[PDB]
């Protein structure tokens, strides 16, 4: 009977939704050596360059590709910088930034399709037979969030942790952790309820741990580490959380599913396949945390 619930998505790890906006080595990005990044708007940048020596400054910077690293801003007296939409901090340890999805007002939010995809991945831990006419997802009403303040965004380094952590040249503009994101979700009780959602998220997280990530934490594992079950109301929002987060087929044994997706992804591609996959954390500093990526905490409240 349209059981509306207020979902407060506590961002336990870095949450990234992307939205189709790639930021290149020096293309709208302004990264300085004080461990923060500023970013600019294309219109005011282009008219600020076309007001002063149009063909000259275009041919100078086009000559200076690819080595730019925003010190033409310093040498040319262009230290005058009104081109700050918002400032973002960078977590390092060569640049290609992916930014978070923002609405037309330039103030970020998580769209409701993302959260429905996450809960659909959490609910579908029955057999993978649920097609595009399943009646249970036509009665789940999830909205977007309110506009998150721009100070809760942080640029991270994507690190891979298979045997030992090594970085990959890919920055994505995630959320800083313990950040509360507020959704409003409603559904028909004839198909799913609070109990089904908490049990599905609990089941998905516990199989995610005991079939792949506890195996990460004990197998091919050393002291490079220096969280279950807490309640457990934990889901993975699509921040590059991994292959096994997005799929569902760690149902219903550890072995045959691992060799199945082993063949399936890493046979047809270039690198050689066998056990096991690689884990993707992020990192912040001098001691490091190696805090893991895509995870979040989910709370359900009556109205």
């Amino acid at each position: 009977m349209k059981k509306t619930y207020r979902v407060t998505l506590t961002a336990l790890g870095p949450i990234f939704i992307g939205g189709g906006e790639k930021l290149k080595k020096y293309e709208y990005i302004f990264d300085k050596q004080k461990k923060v990044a500023h970013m600019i708007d294309h219109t005011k940048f282009t008219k600020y360059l076309l007001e002063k020596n149009l063909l000259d400054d275009f041919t100078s910077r086009v000559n200076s590709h690819f080595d730019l690293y925003d010190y033409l801003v310093n040498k040319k007296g262009i230290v005058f910088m009104p081109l700050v939409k918002y400032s973002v901090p960078v977590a390092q340890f060569m640049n290609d930034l992916n930014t978070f999805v923002k609405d037309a007002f330039g103030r970020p939010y998580i769209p409701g399709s993302s959260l429905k995809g996450a809960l659909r991945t959490a609910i579908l831990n029955d057999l993978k037979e649920d097609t595009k006419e399943n009646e249970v997802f036509a009665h789940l009403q999830v909205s977007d969030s309110e506009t998150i303040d721009l100070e809760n965004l942080k640029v991270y380094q994507k690190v891979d942790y298979s045997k030992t952590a090594k970085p990959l040249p890919l920055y994505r503009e995630c959320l800083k952790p313990n950040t509360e994101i507020t959704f409003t979700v409603s559904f028909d009780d004839e198909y799913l309820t609070l109990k089904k959602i908490q049990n599905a998220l609990h089941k998905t997280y516990q199989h995610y741990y005991i079939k792949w990530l506890k195996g990460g934490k004990v197998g091919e594992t050393l002291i490079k580490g220096v969280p279950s079950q807490n309640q457990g109301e934990i889901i993975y929002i699509g921040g590059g959380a991994g292959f096994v987060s997005k799929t569902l087929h760690y149902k219903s044994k550890n072995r045959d599913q691992a060799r199945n997706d082993s063949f399936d992804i890493l046979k047809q591609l270039f690198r050689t396949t066998y056990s096991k996959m690689r884990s993707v954390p992020d990192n912040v500093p001098t001691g490091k945390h190696y805090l893991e990526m895509g995870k979040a905490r989910i709370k359900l409240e009556e109205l």
């Binding site: 009977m1 349209k2 509306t4 992307g18 939205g19 189709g20 999805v101 609405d103 037309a104 007002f105 769209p111 409701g112 399709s113 959260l115 429905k116 995809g117 991945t121 579908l124 993978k128 036509a138 789940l140 009403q141 999830v142 909205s143 977007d144 409603s186 292959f243 997005k246 799929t247 569902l248 087929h249 399936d264 992804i265």
Partner: protein, 214 residues
């Protein structure tokens, strides 16, 4: 003797509605939004608003379940929206209209365009290969000034009919308006509701703004 229900629909979320005959570029948006094709500036069809209002009223009246054909709704719904059964055709006392965007000047104050391309995909859960799409979605905080002509038939039912109309205004607050609304779109807010006469003067019209614009 008609009444005009002036109002304003305030967008909280995207509200992608409609099918266009626009040719879609392949690196661009597919299935764009419906527009008022003179300027082709964004449009809310009257048929969409009528369909959602009739659906949400026909759920709350006949409380809960709904599996019947639209001519077999309750008497309030048929006398408010119309009928096509052979014995008793009811001429609709409501008359919806296509609602064009009104606050484009308010949007040019904020210096944003009137609509936005939203990026979505679909992850096939077997091999985790995606399948992208773009949808053209109106921005939030856009107003839509509308007016619905109430055709007064008899004053014994006008109070009940505006109570049902405010009920359907309330019910559409908690449900989408059109398009991919189960996934976060179409959240509307009926703000600054009012009613007025066309010609002449309804003597009990001060009670009608109390049961509607409140």
């Amino acid at each position: 003797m008609k009444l005009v229900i002036e109002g304003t629909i305030v967008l909280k979320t995207g509200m992608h509605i409609g099918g266009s005959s626009d040719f879609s570029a392949i690196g661009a948006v597919a299935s764009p939004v419906v527009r008022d094709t003179l300027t082709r500036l964004p449009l809310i069809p009257g048929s969409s608003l009528k369909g959602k209002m009739r659906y949400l009223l026909a759920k709350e009246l006949n409380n809960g379940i709904l599996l019947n054909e639209p001519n077999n709704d309750q008497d309030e719904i048929l006398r408010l929206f119309g009928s096509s059964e052979k014995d008793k055709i009811r001429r609709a006392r409501l008359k919806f209209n296509d609602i064009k965007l009104s606050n484009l000047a308010e949007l040019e104050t904020f210096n944003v365009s009137s609509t936005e391309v939203k990026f979505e995909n679909t992850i096939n859960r077997k091999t985790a290969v995606a399948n992208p799409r773009q949808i053209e979605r109106v921005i939030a905080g856009s107003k839509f000034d509308f007016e619905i002509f109430y055709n007064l038939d008899d004053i014994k039912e006008v109070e009940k009919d505006f109570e049902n109309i405010k009920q359907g205004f309330d019910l559409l607050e908690f449900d989408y308006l059109g398009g991919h609304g189960t996934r976060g779109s179409g959240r509307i807010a009926f703000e600054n509701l009012s009613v007025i006469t066309a010609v002449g003067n309804f003597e009990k019209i001060n009670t009608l703004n109390e049961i509607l614009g409140a």
